[PDB]
Design a protein around this ligand. Structure first.
Ligand SMILES: *[C@@H]1O[C@H](CO)[C@@H](O[C@@H]2O[C@H](CO)[C@@H](O[C@@H]3O[C@H](CO)[C@@H](O)[C@H](O)[C@@H]3O)[C@H](O)[C@H]2NC(C)=O)[C@H](O)[C@H]1NC(C)=O
Ligand SMILES: *[C@@H]1O[C@H](CO)[C@@H](O)[C@H](O)[C@H]1NC(C)=O
Lengths: 51, 36, 51
């Protein structure tokens, strides 16, 4: 398994937290590139607003 | 939908512009900004 | 056993067992990779396990 730099969410302008709708997903920093993965299997993809 | 690169052959073959006829309310904002 | 390959197609058309398994993987975690790197590994591993 990989070591993943997870974030609890994004807080835009210091006011608006946004978090992934689905609890089974991890938002993480791939050396500055934000990506989303399953908590079970490392199958990463880019985030969309609809997440 | 979710975005995944790759295009593993057996996919609807379509341009970004034509996409709005497959997914209603899709907006190509970049093209739009170039026109407006 | 035939139910493993008689995937949900018209007629009584079957699918490759490789596909059947891919579906059973997506069930667990939606797969984001077009190419099945995992299948040759798992087929080989499976074959050893059965032997
Ligand atoms: C959607 O458009 C793509 C891109 O034009 C088409 O996929 C490509 O189709 C050709 C025909 O299906 C593939 O066959 C190739 O033929 C040459 C002989 O002319 C041969 O040397 C190559 O080995 C090969 O088999 C090509 O690989 C393939 N594209 C992909 C991604 O594999 C695809 O046909 C169109 N999609 C659909 C659903 O038809
Ligand atoms: C899309 O618009 C942004 C805003 O005008 C501009 O930075 C970007 O380069 C445009 N992208 C494309 C692909 O034309």
């Amino acid at each position: 398994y990989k070591n993943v730099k997870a974030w609890s969410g994004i807080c835009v302008d210091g006011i608006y937290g946004y978090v992934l709708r689905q609890p089974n997903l991890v938002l993480y920093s791939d050396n500055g590139v934000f990506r989303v993965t399953s908590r079970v299997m490392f199958q990463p993809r880019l985030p969309v607003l609809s997440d | 939908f979710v975005q995944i690169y790759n295009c593993n052959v057996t996919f609807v073959n379509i341009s970004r512009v034509e996409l709005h006829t497959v997914i209603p309310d899709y907006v190509d904002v970049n093209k739009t900004l170039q026109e407006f | 056993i035939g139910g493993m390959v008689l995937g949900g197609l018209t007629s009584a058309a079957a699918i490759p067992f490789s596909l059947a398994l891919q579906a059973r993987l997506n069930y667990v975690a939606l797969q984001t990779d077009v190419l099945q790197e995992n299948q040759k590994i798992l087929a080989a591993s499976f074959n050893k396990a059965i032997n």
